[PDB]
Amino acid sequence: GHQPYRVVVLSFELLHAPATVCGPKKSTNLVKNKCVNFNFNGLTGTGVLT
């Protein structure tokens, strides 16, 4: 109650501007020659990768 304490405060905000600041993006392995779904950097679809 009388000992030093270190304090850190984080603030966020939004407005009419590009985000340009985002956190981690997870990833999976790559498979071929099988009917599989895919998400290749924002593009979604289903097919066979060759």
């Binding site: 009419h16 501007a17 590009p18 340009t20």
Partner: protein
């Protein structure tokens, strides 16, 4: 686009596309621009 040009005093009669280099999320407006030289 960097095009090697033969000896000529005018823009050549040809076609050449311009590839993109970089995109910057600045979100600012532009109305005037200038030139810079070295001496």
């Amino acid at each position: 686009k960097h095009t090697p040009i033969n000896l000529e005093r005018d823009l050549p009669q040809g076609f050449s596309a311009l590839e993109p280099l970089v995109d910057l999320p600045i979100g600012i407006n532009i109305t005037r621009f200038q030139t810079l030289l070295a001496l």
